[PDB]
Amino acid sequence: DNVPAHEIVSGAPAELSRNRVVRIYQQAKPATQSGEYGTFAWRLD
Amino acid sequence: KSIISYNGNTIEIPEEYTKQAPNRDSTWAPAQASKTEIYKNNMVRFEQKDLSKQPMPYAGIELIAQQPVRFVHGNTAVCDGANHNGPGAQGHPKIFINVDAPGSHACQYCGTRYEKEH
Amino acid sequence: HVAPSAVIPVTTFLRDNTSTQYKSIIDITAVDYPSRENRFEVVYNFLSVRHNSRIRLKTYATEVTPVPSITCLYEGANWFEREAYDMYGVFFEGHPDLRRIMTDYGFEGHPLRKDFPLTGYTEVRWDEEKRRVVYEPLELTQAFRNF
Amino acid sequence: PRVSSSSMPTDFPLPSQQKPNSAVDYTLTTLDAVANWARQGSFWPVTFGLACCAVEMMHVSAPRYDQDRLGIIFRASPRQSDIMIVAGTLTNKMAPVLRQVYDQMPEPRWVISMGSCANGGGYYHFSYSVVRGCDRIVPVDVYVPGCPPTSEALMYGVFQLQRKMRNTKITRMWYRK
Amino acid sequence: MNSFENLAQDVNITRSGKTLIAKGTGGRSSRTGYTATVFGANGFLGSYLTAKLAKHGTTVVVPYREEMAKRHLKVTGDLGVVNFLEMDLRNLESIDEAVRHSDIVVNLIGREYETKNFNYYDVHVEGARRIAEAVKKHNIARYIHVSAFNAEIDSPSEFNHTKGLGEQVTKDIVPWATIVRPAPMFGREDKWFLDRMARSPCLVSANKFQETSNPVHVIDVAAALERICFDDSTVAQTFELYGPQKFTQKQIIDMVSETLRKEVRHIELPKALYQAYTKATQAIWWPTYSPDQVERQFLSQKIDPSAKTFNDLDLTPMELPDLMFKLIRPYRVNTFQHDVSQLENKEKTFVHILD
Amino acid sequence: RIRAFTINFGPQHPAAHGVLRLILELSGEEIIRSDPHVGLLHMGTEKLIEYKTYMQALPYFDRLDYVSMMTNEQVFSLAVEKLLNVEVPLRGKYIRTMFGEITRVLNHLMSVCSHAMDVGALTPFLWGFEEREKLMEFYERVSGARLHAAYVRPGGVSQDLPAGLLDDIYMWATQFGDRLDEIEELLTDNRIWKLRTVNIGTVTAQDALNLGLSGPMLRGSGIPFDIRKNAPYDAYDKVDFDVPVGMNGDCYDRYLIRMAEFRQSLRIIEQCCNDMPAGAVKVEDFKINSPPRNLMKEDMEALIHHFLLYTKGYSVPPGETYTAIEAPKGEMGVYVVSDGSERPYKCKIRAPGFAHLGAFDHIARGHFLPDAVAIIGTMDLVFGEVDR
Amino acid sequence: AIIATAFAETVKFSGSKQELQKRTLALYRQFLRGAPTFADLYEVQFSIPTIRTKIRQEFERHRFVDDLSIQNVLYAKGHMEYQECINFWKQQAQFLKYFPEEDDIQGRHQPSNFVDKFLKNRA
Amino acid sequence: GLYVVLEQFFRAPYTIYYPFEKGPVSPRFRGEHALRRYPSGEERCIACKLCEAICPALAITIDAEERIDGSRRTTKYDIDMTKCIYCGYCQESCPVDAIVETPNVEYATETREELLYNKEKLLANGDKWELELQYALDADAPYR
Amino acid sequence: SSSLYRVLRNAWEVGPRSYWKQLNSIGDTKSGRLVGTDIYGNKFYETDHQDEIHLRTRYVEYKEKDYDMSQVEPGWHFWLGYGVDTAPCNTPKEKLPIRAYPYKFQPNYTGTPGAFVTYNTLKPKISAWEPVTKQRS
Ligand SMILES: NC(=O)C1=CN([C@@H]2O[C@H](COP(=O)(O)OP(=O)(O)OC[C@H]3O[C@@H](n4cnc5c(N)ncnc54)[C@H](OP(=O)(O)O)[C@@H]3O)[C@@H](O)[C@H]2O)C=CC1
Ligand code: SF4
Ligand code: SF4
Ligand SMILES: [Zn+2]
């Protein structure tokens, strides 16, 4: 395993670690436009 | 007007202040809150206040229906709400309305109407 | 571009060598690039009034891997390193008194990290009962709209 | 013969709309008017609260807009002062100091909030290090809008505050109470 | 996140047919739906009450007479939560305005002394009747009177006589009325208890300091009123919020003197003389003890055992001897340090006089 | 053993031009240690800028100093032009110059005349603030606002000068030398001013460099550094002026430097008023600067560009830069980073008052409290800057 | 030179757990010796033993952390807080952030089972 | 130095009496907000929501929908003047010159909820100050 | 100028009634031609004397004893302020805005019942359902 727990030094709450979910993704190619620049980046929300 | 509160009581308000504006009673858009629903939800903050002195501007939807239609020879009317009195633009972007169709047609910015001479 | 071990030596060269008398310390700054393994990137800016030139010097760090302090050479780095610690969490080894300078005395978090929300986690109000400014969880009356 | 009735009047007008008609009423009105004359002609704020946006407040101490002509004097110390001017950003590292200075002031005391950053946090409303309004700490009587409010806005706000204290009831309320 | 510690659910429904949906986590921005009315929030107990109500977004209507005593309430909540009206018991429309849109009403009215415009009767009986008739007309779902401890319809004290008549009139017009009967309350900036024993140059008792009572922290009574405003089980009920420990006046004074490290001054001069000196002090414009209160110095607390208590609300009321330190440390003089000996040798190492 | 006595100068201090908790430790009168605490006014600018476009963020940089706005935004404009790789038109350069010097006057007035008032001389303050209030009419004429303005924007200037402004500037300029001289009469040759400013705050060249000090604090040690000459930016290369320098590094030399900068700035204002070239005041690339309205209301591409600049904003190339200026306080600077978006990725404001206050401990050791007041007055820290 | 303040320790990252053990123990000892000062300087409404209890709790929080660098970070942060507290930099609010428990019971319903959370929409 | 002080004793003071004599004001000045109308009586706002986007402080809050006559118009337009910094980017973005900033600065209040201006409070403010807005626009538009 | 000859000559120019009025309102004595009066009744003057420095040429004489600058009608609030040289009374016709609606000037009513109350022009975005029941035929 041996992945450091920076959550202890982050100074942030623990509720983010214990109750909250994230999603990692690429923004879908919009159908209203034909561009693709907003993609290629992996957002986290 | 007597408006029934949610808590079973009543809310008396005179007729001049229930109109949505001094020139129109009804609402001019589906999401608009009528003055009765406003009062009924907010009388705690209207109670000891004078309603004569609150802002009650006129509505434009009724003042623009009064404006006479304009006419043109051709399938186009150009609009630019320009003052013509002072310098600069002072109006709205140029817009060419098609007026071939039988009825009147209004600019999308200002509501001035145009017709094909008939 | 250098590594944290190379900071004191290269700074000695850039301060003492004749052709590179970079005696003034203009700034220290950290930057967060979470995509990297070493997310932080400490940046020294330097100046030479002698030759009329500036130069930069970049290292890298982590939330736990410290950086050597150049207070041994440039005394003005004291406050700038205290800032970079308080803002990003970087630890400047050898620093005589490293402590927060901007943020509130009991603040828990490092603001300019990209994981830290804009508004923070806390807010203060006056409690008439306790008669004390008390810290409570955040609740905004108009939420942040990013655009 | 213990009391067991009450001639308590209805329709007694409220203080805002209570006109005088008795000699005691004119007397208490005169005493209140003199006390309020005093409170108006001598309007001494405390030097605290002027952190950010102190330039526009100093311009009201300047020649073109003299505040001293109205009897305004800024004082180092709360204990001699009556008014507090929360200019500038009210940060979370500073709010307790503000409440200390406000509790140290001797009553009567007012508060006037100069600028947007002190009324609702203004520009830094969404920041981690800000109180989103000085209302959250202290009670505010007048809110000057602006960022930075013009010297004229500050003078007008003081002229609204003088009006508040001038339509105040010190003894007439006791004659009601 | 914050919590709605006062509410058990988020969808509540009053007995007047209003639905009240909660919004938020329970902070400054949240709303409880409720709309209340507190007739003495300017005072000692009502201040703590509005603070507890408006901390969670409950709209609070606060009738006032002095504009300047109240301003310390606007702090207690977000914009639009605390709402103020100028009111007087001699004007009826003002009272209908204050109670119209309310789901809850709270009467904290009552002076510990008489005046020129208000005797004990007019303020504890007629004022209660006026408010009750308006609470009835508008059919407000809840009414929460507060009538003083030891209240009894006929008694040596006119205060307790009126307070008892205010009870029966409220409950004989508003049958669903809740009545609370707090015992002598104490806390920070109290009226006649700790600020007096800590500030007054000399105490006096027409009895000995022998009047027995059960005192209570005011924050807990405010917690009680909060836990009654929202619990609809408490209609047509009565409460005795007295406190675990029985304390004679002399016991309280000795604890006050111990904690203060200063010798409180008590005199114990007889009844008629003190009663006369109080009567003559009622002509100066500021509140002072009044002839009817030295009468209550001989009336210890009779507790009604038929009425509900703190333990019917899941509360654990606090003890005076613990809290007296927090409440009297400001007047603690703290003269100097103890036993300076065994410090000469340490002080001898430091430089005391520079040149 | 010297045991110390800790005192707070006070977060509620009338003298300071802002809020500062200064924790001093005294052995009688002499200061031996100093721990300037700050953050009582830190608003959190450097984080918020990361969520705002390059245009929406310009107002941030005007609130970083109660005075000296038009220079403080002149640094962001230069950074973002250096990234965008555009060139400002000549008239915009001369205007940015002229208003930069009007701003340096407006700062040196407040600074010198707050040093005075903290040292006790109430009068030069109120003799100078009127001059400031005549010079702020020029501000309200060009921008609309009296202090925080936003005139200078990336790509030049927001709107052109209104007619009949250079004339009024020339009038004020012909009359300003007299009022500066009236201030010099009270302060310069006086005994008490020298007693309070001669051999105080004395700092050496090598220390002033090691501590990051710039501006008059450095030019009082004997080093002729002025970014306006060693790295001209707007038009300081196309207009004559001289840089004063002083020995002894005291407060008196810094006061003399500041008065010299008043007069040299007056020389510059006269020159720029005598030669303001015609042309545009903003870049003619409507992909960076919003167009005129008589086009936005008549041409399509101009309305599109207006829409995008005032919704999404303009895309700066990826890169990074520290660019700096000779702000009246010292060497102000901005470290911007770009990622190809309309929003910055990082923006660190280097604030000269920061390093000044940081040196305050080295500078005050050995001096009595009145001298500490005079020291903070030499630096005339604006604590909104110090707290960033 | 810009000299260090009163109780400042130079940041020094130990290479071993056995030395940091000692440094942490000295920090704990200093907190305990200084707790009465933390009660005098901040106008506190409870016991010195309760302060020492909270200190023991805060040190038990990170008792089971075996990564050395994180321990060095924790120790440095704790020395920062000791310097903040013993020098009278913190005011009462920032200190009683560590003592929520001592303040009066916040209301009645503090959900601990599912159904109450559901009735309050917290599940 | 004392004599240089005395000569000022005999010179004209700079002071003006504010409520009876106001200080200089320019067409470019930025004070209170206002929503304008056309000479027809119709309002100029079309809910382009550019003022809502460029505003640094995010004070503005808008919500539109199709009006009964088939046009684009607002049902909500708010400004929190406690969030406003008075930058004038909102009078710059509007392509119809609806929202403006008046030279008015005399609009202090006793409450913070009188400063959460809504659409009706702005439309009346524009009906009131229209003559002043026309002066400022006739002498500011060419440069804007 | 702050000289006594100024106030004396001014009090000779404008009569003693106006002198006591000016002393009770402004605190100074000032004399100048009338330019006109607004809709609230406030009169606006202008001076030409050399003694009067910049920003003291134009002045006001309010009608109400409880004067406030909010009582000044628009146009004058801009002329009073040196925004223009021509008053609304003499400004030409084409420069006057056209109004399809009546004018109605209302000052800052703060501190009084007529203070502006804010409200939501919208209704709740999520409209709920009004119950109606059916039977199981
Ligand atoms: N505190 C205690 O120890 C005990 C209190 N009680 C009862 O509990 C309540 C607590 O009041 P307390 O906390 O003592 O602080 P106060 O008694 O000062 O609260 C008095 C309130 O009643 C209002 N009030 C009094 N007389 C009138 C009137 N004639 N017309 C209108 N409003 C009036 C006052 O308004 P303003 O302040 O604006 O004048 C004030 O807000 C009282 O009903 C008291 O009888 C019972 C037993 C003990
Ligand atoms: S000018 Fe005022 S309302 Fe307009 S965007 Fe700027 S801060 Fe917002
Ligand atoms: S920019 Fe103008 S038209 Fe567009 S929403 Fe704003 S006020 Fe309305
Ligand atoms: Zn059109």
Short mmCIF file of N, CA, C and O in Angstrom, two decimals, chain H residues 10-42:
data_model
loop_
_atom_site.label_atom_id
_atom_site.label_comp_id
_atom_site.label_asym_id
_atom_site.label_seq_id
_atom_site.Cartn_x
_atom_site.Cartn_y
_atom_site.Cartn_z
N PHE H 10 -4.10 84.50 6.60
CA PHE H 10 -4.71 85.63 5.93
C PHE H 10 -5.17 85.31 4.52
O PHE H 10 -5.52 86.23 3.78
N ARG H 11 -5.16 84.05 4.14
CA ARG H 11 -5.50 83.59 2.81
C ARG H 11 -6.86 82.90 2.82
O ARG H 11 -7.39 82.55 3.87
N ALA H 12 -7.40 82.72 1.64
CA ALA H 12 -8.75 82.21 1.51
C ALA H 12 -8.83 80.74 1.89
O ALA H 12 -8.10 79.92 1.32
N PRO H 13 -9.70 80.35 2.81
CA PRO H 13 -9.86 78.94 3.11
C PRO H 13 -10.51 78.20 1.95
O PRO H 13 -11.23 78.78 1.14
N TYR H 14 -10.22 76.92 1.88
CA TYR H 14 -10.66 76.07 0.79
C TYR H 14 -12.03 75.46 1.00
O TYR H 14 -12.57 74.86 0.07
N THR H 15 -12.62 75.61 2.18
CA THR H 15 -13.77 74.83 2.58
C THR H 15 -15.04 75.26 1.85
O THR H 15 -15.25 76.44 1.57
N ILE H 16 -15.89 74.28 1.60
CA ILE H 16 -17.20 74.45 1.00
C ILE H 16 -18.22 73.83 1.94
O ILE H 16 -17.92 72.90 2.68
N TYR H 17 -19.44 74.36 1.89
CA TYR H 17 -20.54 73.86 2.70
C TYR H 17 -21.30 72.83 1.88
O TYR H 17 -22.01 73.19 0.94
N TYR H 18 -21.14 71.54 2.24
CA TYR H 18 -21.57 70.47 1.34
C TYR H 18 -23.06 70.50 1.02
O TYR H 18 -23.41 70.49 -0.17
N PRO H 19 -23.96 70.50 1.99
CA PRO H 19 -25.38 70.32 1.66
C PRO H 19 -25.96 71.46 0.88
O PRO H 19 -27.05 71.31 0.32
N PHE H 20 -25.30 72.61 0.86
CA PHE H 20 -25.72 73.77 0.11
C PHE H 20 -24.85 74.05 -1.09
O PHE H 20 -25.31 74.70 -2.02
N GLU H 21 -23.63 73.55 -1.09
CA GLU H 21 -22.72 73.64 -2.22
C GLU H 21 -22.01 72.31 -2.36
O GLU H 21 -21.24 71.93 -1.47
N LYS H 22 -22.24 71.63 -3.46
CA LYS H 22 -21.64 70.34 -3.73
C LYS H 22 -20.34 70.50 -4.49
O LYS H 22 -20.08 71.53 -5.12
N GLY H 23 -19.50 69.48 -4.39
CA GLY H 23 -18.24 69.44 -5.07
C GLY H 23 -18.36 68.99 -6.50
O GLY H 23 -19.42 68.54 -6.94
N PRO H 24 -17.27 69.09 -7.25
CA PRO H 24 -17.34 68.82 -8.68
C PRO H 24 -17.72 67.37 -8.95
O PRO H 24 -17.35 66.46 -8.22
N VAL H 25 -18.47 67.20 -10.03
CA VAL H 25 -19.00 65.91 -10.44
C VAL H 25 -18.86 65.86 -11.94
O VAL H 25 -19.05 66.87 -12.62
N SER H 26 -18.53 64.68 -12.46
CA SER H 26 -18.27 64.50 -13.87
C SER H 26 -19.26 63.53 -14.48
O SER H 26 -19.82 62.69 -13.77
N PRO H 27 -19.50 63.62 -15.78
CA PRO H 27 -20.36 62.64 -16.44
C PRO H 27 -19.88 61.23 -16.32
O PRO H 27 -20.69 60.30 -16.33
N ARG H 28 -18.58 61.03 -16.24
CA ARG H 28 -18.01 59.72 -16.06
C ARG H 28 -18.22 59.17 -14.66
O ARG H 28 -17.90 58.00 -14.44
N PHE H 29 -18.74 59.95 -13.73
CA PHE H 29 -18.85 59.52 -12.35
C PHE H 29 -19.78 58.32 -12.21
O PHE H 29 -20.71 58.12 -12.99
N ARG H 30 -19.48 57.52 -11.19
CA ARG H 30 -20.10 56.24 -10.94
C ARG H 30 -20.63 56.22 -9.52
O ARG H 30 -19.86 56.06 -8.57
N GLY H 31 -21.94 56.38 -9.39
CA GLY H 31 -22.63 56.27 -8.13
C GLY H 31 -23.73 55.23 -8.15
O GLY H 31 -23.49 54.07 -8.48
N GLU H 32 -24.94 55.64 -7.80
CA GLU H 32 -26.06 54.72 -7.73
C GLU H 32 -26.40 54.19 -9.10
O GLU H 32 -26.04 54.75 -10.13
N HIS H 33 -27.06 53.05 -9.10
CA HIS H 33 -27.46 52.37 -10.31
C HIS H 33 -28.86 52.73 -10.73
O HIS H 33 -29.64 53.31 -9.97
N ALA H 34 -29.18 52.38 -11.95
CA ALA H 34 -30.42 52.76 -12.57
C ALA H 34 -30.65 51.92 -13.79
O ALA H 34 -29.69 51.51 -14.45
N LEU H 35 -31.91 51.68 -14.11
CA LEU H 35 -32.31 51.02 -15.34
C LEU H 35 -33.14 51.98 -16.15
O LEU H 35 -34.12 52.53 -15.66
N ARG H 36 -32.74 52.17 -17.39
CA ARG H 36 -33.30 53.18 -18.25
C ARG H 36 -34.47 52.65 -19.05
O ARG H 36 -34.85 51.48 -18.96
N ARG H 37 -35.07 53.54 -19.83
CA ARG H 37 -36.14 53.24 -20.76
C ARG H 37 -35.88 53.96 -22.07
O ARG H 37 -35.12 54.93 -22.13
N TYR H 38 -36.51 53.48 -23.10
CA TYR H 38 -36.59 54.18 -24.35
C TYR H 38 -37.59 55.33 -24.24
O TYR H 38 -38.40 55.36 -23.31
N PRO H 39 -37.55 56.28 -25.17
CA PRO H 39 -38.60 57.30 -25.20
C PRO H 39 -39.99 56.72 -25.38
O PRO H 39 -40.97 57.40 -25.04
N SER H 40 -40.10 55.52 -25.93
CA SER H 40 -41.37 54.84 -26.09
C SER H 40 -42.00 54.44 -24.77
O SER H 40 -43.20 54.18 -24.73
N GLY H 41 -41.22 54.38 -23.70
CA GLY H 41 -41.67 53.90 -22.42
C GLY H 41 -41.29 52.46 -22.13
O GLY H 41 -41.42 52.02 -20.98
N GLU H 42 -40.86 51.73 -23.13
CA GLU H 42 -40.36 50.38 -22.94
C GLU H 42 -38.97 50.37 -22.33
O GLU H 42 -38.16 51.26 -22.57
#
